Amino acid sequence: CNRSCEVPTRLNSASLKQPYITQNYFPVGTVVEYECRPGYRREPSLSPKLTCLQNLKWSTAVEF
Amino acid sequence: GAQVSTQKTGAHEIIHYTNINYYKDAASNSANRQDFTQDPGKFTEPVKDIMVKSLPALN
Amino acid sequence: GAQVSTQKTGAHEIIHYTNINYYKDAASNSANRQDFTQDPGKFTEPVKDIMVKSLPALN
Amino acid sequence: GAQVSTQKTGAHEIIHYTNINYYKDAASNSANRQDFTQDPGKFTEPVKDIMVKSLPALN
Amino acid sequence: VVRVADTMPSGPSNSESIPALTAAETGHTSQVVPSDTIQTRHVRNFHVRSESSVENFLSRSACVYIVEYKTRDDTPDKMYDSWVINTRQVAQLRRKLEFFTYVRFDVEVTFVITSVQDDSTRQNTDTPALTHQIMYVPPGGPIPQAVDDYNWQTSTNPSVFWTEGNAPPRMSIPFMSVGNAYSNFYDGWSHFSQTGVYGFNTLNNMGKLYFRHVNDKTISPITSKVRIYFKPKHVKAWVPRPPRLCEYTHKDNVDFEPKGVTTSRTQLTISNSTHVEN
Amino acid sequence: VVRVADTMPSGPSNSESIPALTAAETGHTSQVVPSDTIQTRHVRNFHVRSESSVENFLSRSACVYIVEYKTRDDTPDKMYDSWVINTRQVAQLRRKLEFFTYVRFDVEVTFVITSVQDDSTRQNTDTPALTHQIMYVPPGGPIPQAVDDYNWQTSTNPSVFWTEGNAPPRMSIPFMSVGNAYSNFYDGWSHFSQTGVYGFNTLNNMGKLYFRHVNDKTISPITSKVRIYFKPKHVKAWVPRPPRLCEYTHKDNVDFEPKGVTTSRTQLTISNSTHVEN
Amino acid sequence: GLPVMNTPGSNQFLTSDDYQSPTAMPQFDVTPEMNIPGEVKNLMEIAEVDSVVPVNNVNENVNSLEAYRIPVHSVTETGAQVFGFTLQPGADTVMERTLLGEILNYYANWSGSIKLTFMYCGSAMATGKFLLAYSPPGAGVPKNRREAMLGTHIIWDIGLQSSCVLCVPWISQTHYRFVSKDIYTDAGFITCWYQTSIVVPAEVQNQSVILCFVSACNDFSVRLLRDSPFVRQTAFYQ
Amino acid sequence: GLPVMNTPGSNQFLTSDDYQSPTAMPQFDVTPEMNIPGEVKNLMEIAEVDSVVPVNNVNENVNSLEAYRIPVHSVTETGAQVFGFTLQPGADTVMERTLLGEILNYYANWSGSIKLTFMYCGSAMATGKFLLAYSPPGAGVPKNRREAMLGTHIIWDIGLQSSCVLCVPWISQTHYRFVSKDIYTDAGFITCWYQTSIVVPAEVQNQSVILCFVSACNDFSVRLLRDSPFVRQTAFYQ
Amino acid sequence: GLPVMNTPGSNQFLTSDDYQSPTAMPQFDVTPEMNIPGEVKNLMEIAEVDSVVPVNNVNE
Amino acid sequence: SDRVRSITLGNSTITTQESANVVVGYGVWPDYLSDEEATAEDQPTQPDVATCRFYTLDSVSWMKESQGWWWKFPDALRDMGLFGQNMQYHYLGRSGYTIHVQCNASKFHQGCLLVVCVPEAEMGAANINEKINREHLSNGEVANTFSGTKSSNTNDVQQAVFNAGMGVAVGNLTIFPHQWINLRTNNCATIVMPYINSVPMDNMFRHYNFTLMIIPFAKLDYAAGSSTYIPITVTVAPMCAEYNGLRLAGHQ
Numbered sequence A: 001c002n003r004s005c006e007v008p009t010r011l012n013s014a015s016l017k018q019p020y021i022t023q024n025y026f027p028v029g030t031v032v033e034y035e036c037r038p039g040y041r042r043e044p045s046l047s048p049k050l051t052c053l054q055n056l057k058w059s060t061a062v063e064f
Numbered sequence B, C, D: 001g002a003q004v005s006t007q008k009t010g011a012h013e014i015i016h017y018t019n020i021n022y023y024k025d026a027a028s029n030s031a032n033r034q035d036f037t038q039d040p041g042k043f044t045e046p047v048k049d050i051m052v053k054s055l056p057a058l059n
Numbered sequence E, F: 001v002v003r004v005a006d007t008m009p010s011g012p013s014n015s016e017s018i019p020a021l022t023a024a025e026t027g028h029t030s031q032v033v034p035s036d037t038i039q040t041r042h043v044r045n046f047h048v049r050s051e052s053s054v055e056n057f058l059s060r061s062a063c064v065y066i067v068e069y070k071t072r073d074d075t076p077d078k079m080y081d082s083w084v085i086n087t088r089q090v091a092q093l094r095r096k097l098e099f100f101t102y103v104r105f106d107v108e109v110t111f112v113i114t115s116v117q118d119d120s121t122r123q124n125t126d127t128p129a130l131t132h133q134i135m136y137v138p139p140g141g142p143i144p145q146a147v148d149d150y151n152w153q154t155s156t157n158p159s160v161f162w163t164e165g166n167a168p169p170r171m172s173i174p175f176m177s178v179g180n181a182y183s184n185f186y187d188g189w190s191h192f193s194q195t196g197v198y199g200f201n202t203l204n205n206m207g208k209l210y211f212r213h214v215n216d217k218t219i220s221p222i223t224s225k226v227r228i229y230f231k232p233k234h235v236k237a238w239v240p241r242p243p244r245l246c247e248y249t250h251k252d253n254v255d256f257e258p259k260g261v262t263t264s265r266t267q268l269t270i271s272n273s274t275h276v277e278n
Numbered sequence G, H: 001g002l003p004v005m006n007t008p009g010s011n012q013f014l015t016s017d018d019y020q021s022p023t024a025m026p027q028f029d030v031t032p033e034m035n036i037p038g039e040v041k042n043l044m045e046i047a048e049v050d051s052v053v054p055v056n057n058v059n060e061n062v063n064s065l066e067a068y069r070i071p072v073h074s075v076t077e078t079g080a081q082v083f084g085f086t087l088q089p090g091a092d093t094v095m096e097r098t099l100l101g102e103i104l105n106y107y108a109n110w111s112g113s114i115k116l117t118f119m120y121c122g123s124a125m126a127t128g129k130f131l132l133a134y135s136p137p138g139a140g141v142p143k144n145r146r147e148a149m150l151g152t153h154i155i156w157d158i159g160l161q162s163s164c165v166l167c168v169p170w171i172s173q174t175h176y177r178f179v180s181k182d183i184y185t186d187a188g189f190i191t192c193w194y195q196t197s198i199v200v201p202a203e204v205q206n207q208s209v210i211l212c213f214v215s216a217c218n219d220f221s222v223r224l225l226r227d228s229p230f231v232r233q234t235a236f237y238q
Numbered sequence I: 001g002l003p004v005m006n007t008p009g010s011n012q013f014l015t016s017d018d019y020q021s022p023t024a025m026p027q028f029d030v031t032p033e034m035n036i037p038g039e040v041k042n043l044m045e046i047a048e049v050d051s052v053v054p055v056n057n058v059n060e
Numbered sequence J: 001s002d003r004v005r006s007i008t009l010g011n012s013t014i015t016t017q018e019s020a021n022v023v024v025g026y027g028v029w030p031d032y033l034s035d036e037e038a039t040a041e042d043q044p045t046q047p048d049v050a051t052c053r054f055y056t057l058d059s060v061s062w063m064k065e066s067q068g069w070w071w072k073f074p075d076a077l078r079d080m081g082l083f084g085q086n087m088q089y090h091y092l093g094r095s096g097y098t099i100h101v102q103c104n105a106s107k108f109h110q111g112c113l114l115v116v117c118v119p120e121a122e123m124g125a126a127n128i129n130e131k132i133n134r135e136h137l138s139n140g141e142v143a144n145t146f147s148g149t150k151s152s153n154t155n156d157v158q159q160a161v162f163n164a165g166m167g168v169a170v171g172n173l174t175i176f177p178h179q180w181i182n183l184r185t186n187n188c189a190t191i192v193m194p195y196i197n198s199v200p201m202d203n204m205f206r207h208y209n210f211t212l213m214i215i216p217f218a219k220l221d222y223a224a225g226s227s228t229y230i231p232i233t234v235t236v237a238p239m240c241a242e243y244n245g246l247r248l249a250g251h252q
């Protein structure tokens, strides 16, 4: 029962991969990774990763 | 920096009012409801060789 | 102790406004959004031996 | 019956304000925060036979 | 606008002029300009002694007392509250006034009134807006004894009515003193035989304030708390005074616990720090 | 009113005057008027560089932080909230200020205060209008530690009281800095041995704000949220700076994740579109 | 006792106000002003300064310095193409994050002419000519050299003066164009074509690099304050 | 009927106001003013007056008059140290509760020069020299006599004129320093060193006492009103 | 501190007002005016123009 | 011809025969502090020509895959004689600078350098929420080197050329006073910086005034047989320097 984050930010063009999409209990420092929603393509100038910070909120994630 | 105009009043029987503009923009001002001029010479009589109204204007 | 300036208006087709300062401090005043001057001669052309723009400026 | 003074402003880089007294009593007025004079000659140097500061001031 | 004094340039000197050697035994503060001992340069100084003046030092709205009173109590003495007017029950404004010995000013007075619903069984009500009355009694007048007394009828006494939700009340009061200035410190007695009460308590004589709810007895208890904010203005002060070191003990005297001069040290010389390592 | 520069007419040319061939190696932006390479006509231009000036660019009421605090909590630390004043926790106003290196302005400050009734069993109340206190502490002053502390008595600190339902509070603040201008970027250390803390964190030193409900402890929990709106005015700026490319990570440094220069393409030449058909 | 009628728009908080406020620090002594060199009074003093355009941003060169290097070499057949992009400072991917583009993305209307400077960073023995051309919209993108020589072009001879200026004039029907993408204010195309070749002597490297700059003229103007589409924040920075 | 728009900041209570108020006692007759000697118009008329510095505050002498007495005697080796403290009027423990420090703790910025007066309260036959020295910060505290003679010092000869004035000038990079402790506005050190010795004849007491004063010059200034960190109250005084 | 008495008709919204308002886009640069032919200053310049009358409107 | 330029300061002289044009600042020439903007009260030390003279820094070798170099100039001139000593005995200091960067090649070489003076170049750390050591920012007269890919050394500067350490696009660094050393036509990277700070005098060790950067955009490239070793030498001279607040020897 450590401190945990919320569900990661639902983007309208990106969904989570499949070790992360089911499991709860995101501790601090945990990185999660997104994949393109099926019909889309990657923007190579942006890295699709999100770190949960000390204040139990994810980093800013906009459009991957 | 005030300006004094006349109020719209009845006829056959010149009262003044005051106006001060407070804001820095021209879109902020009150609407100009005191321009009564007209010129219906571009809609009526829109012709060349301007007619006389006493002549038959043909032949 | 009022001062009268001009309102920002459109071109190709001088309306005045008034302003009175009420408070004792200079930080209390309204913002000065009517200074339009510029001088891009310290960022562009930042050189010594000022060029001519018609000469090749070398050799 | 207004009076115009200067606003307190910064140095090295005269803006006026207005004030009108509305009430009949002198205790009603705003506080006088613009008197900057001083005289520390009654607390420092509080002596008779005023010294010179270049002489030894004794013997 | 009176700027501070400037620094004038100087040079080398070898003469019988000695600004440094003075006699501090003559009750005299030496007036050594910094250009008199070292070689200085021309500095045109633009500093203004503005926010150190007595008006800029004292004209802030300080706080002097808190007053609590209820609107439904079984005892009739907690349905209103009083306060004899002094400025000596909060230490900050008291110390700031006790920089000086005699002062003379007008007072701009503000009340900040807040009401809290007390605890009861029937706590779900629909209460209209509360109305307060703040009555001033000059020294010697008739005093109320209940909330429904007819001594509250304010025919001559200045009283201020306030409705909950608006701006706080504010009124100015002129120099209400019988002397030529107020007395922060009075070294004397009340009776001519040098008996009686000692100190500044003989010279207060300011009258008192009275507070009540204008509304009738409600069906649920509500306490209200009013904070008096004095704010001196048009101020003059005379014969200054060293600031008080020790802590206050009462409002009617200057009696104190003996405190030392300052915070201690470990040795009388200074050196570099002896902490951890390079 | 300073209009933009006009276009003068031109004609054919065959001479040793070459405005096009320049040397961009001399740190020099060429000043080729459009009438120098092609034949132009007389255009009397009426455009005004008004809404690109530094005052018209920075004087908007931006947002800097959100502050939450409750009116009935079991822990005494969530009954009030604080914020050390910087302008570096929202990226928009931070980036707009980081166009320039040194700035100098006055701040017009607005609070937008909203209260939400929290969830409880006894949710049907009859609550009077809430009252908020917003207290500013200059750098070094005494800080409160509870909602009923006597450090809130605002005798010298500027504090602003607000009643629910009125216009939002607004006050102006002059240039509260010890240098000749503010510093958006400081490349140095705190200690003279070039140790300590690095960057602009040495030069903040602004003091902090404190927020509480003036009312007593209510019978039901209400949270309030206050939004500080800074709005710079009387602005001057010096030595400009390229705008920041990468995203911010903290409020006390400039540390970043390396982002590329721009959005990519598929090939280095352009052509017509290769989509569906005629 | 003055008869006062409150108008609509009372007791609101509008963002771009110009009202007066009381001071929280009365009679405060502001520190004296110092003459710091390099004063900015207008953002348009900044946009008139040259800054390099990341032209070669093809799908991997973004993460290096190679986005700024435009390739040029000797070609076995003349009349080819060198590069090309779309003249949209703030919408097009090429000059999106430039200094003019980053001033220009806080706005929503623009007007005026735009300069383009081409520095040849090659050998001192290498020589050759290029065709720097602007084609106003209404037709397609030109596909030959002989279709792009109908536009507003300049032939640039590489010599001792190693840089040229392509000044793109203001050809419009409206007084302003949008900084974003809409079809009513399309703005044209910038293409560059080999005029002859690159000709080098022996033991001199063939493959060289052209660098492109961009700036604004003295008649450039912007109008509508909006927020930039590039600032992104998820939580507070602490 | 006047069109009036209420601005934000209405119906608040700000502490440092300068508004007008109605009088609760209308047409009141104020008693006539009397010329009481010794009028204060500025608090800086008070801070320019000498007051004794409790220098010898070593861990027990606070609770006596011995905090003000600095020891001096004849030394068996010259070049030693006499006392020393840190020039921070309002943060340093030495001149914390002084008159200049108690005016100066209601502020938060200060500027200007500071005077220091040293009265030798010894015998009339005793003689000797001292080294009154100020060292600007940036280096450490000086540890020899020959490191502290590099600063801004004065050699004081004890004679018929029994007091000297060490005037500490204004050496800064900012126009103001903080009255509290931060590392950006450190201010320097004041040290005193035996120059030769104390030399007395027979049947005259060796161990004497130096008293130190402090004051401000005619260019001293304070800026930011805050509350003092020394006032403390727990309940109302009744 | 001015003594102001609010009159009846305060805080209403009347349709045909002629009041002043703050600008939401301060110091905005309006595009220059162009001389488009055929300006109407009065609706009575339009009503003085001939238009055909549908007289034979009998039921089909 | 205007390709020739002589610069004389103190007892040192730099002559160039393939100069293009000397840049001077933001339009401002360096000058001593007037007594209407001064803050300190004692007499400043305008020493002599003993500090206003050219000092030669170390040379870096420009290879085919080099990325960039930077220096920190109130700290880089810390051991160059009397400038370094007057730095070490005074509390305040103030100076403009005349930077002259040399690099030469033959006419068969190609490559382009960018020489910028960046005021207040606040560097970013490699790993994000971690302190930076003083040796990784400024290494005296020795240049620190950018990289091409992102770096992850502990307590180090994030050193990628496409962000220039600060976190901006590197093609936007032409807003500061700059020139180009095109090996086709230049050797004159001369930039006369005035004093730029928000206080009239400042400390030399605690504050870094600006940062020189040499970033090659069009890389050095040559045919086989030419001289492969091409050095770059940076020469810097302080101008109008003065000092104030004398005390004992400082922090080395």
Ligand SMILES: CCCCCCCCCCCCC/C=C/[C@H](O)[C@H](N)CO
Pocket: E085, E086, E087, E097, E103, E107, E109, E134, E135, E136, E158, E159, E160, E171, E173, E176, E182, E183, E184, E204, E206, E209, H024
């Ligand atoms: C209806 C509102 C009236 C409110 C009455 C409250 C204030 C009236 C009392 C006069 C204020 C005098 C202030 C104190 C005077 C002296 O300075 C003190 N004794 C301290 O010396």
Ligand SMILES: CCCCCCCCCCCCC/C=C/[C@H](O)[C@H](N)CO
Pocket: F085, F086, F087, F097, F103, F107, F109, F134, F135, F136, F158, F159, F160, F171, F173, F176, F182, F183, F184, F204, F206, F209, G024
């Ligand atoms: C009683 C109301 C007082 C409210 C106090 C809130 C604001 C007071 C702090 C001063 C505002 C300074 C604004 C920031 C200054 C610099 O620009 C920043 N450090 C960014 O450089």
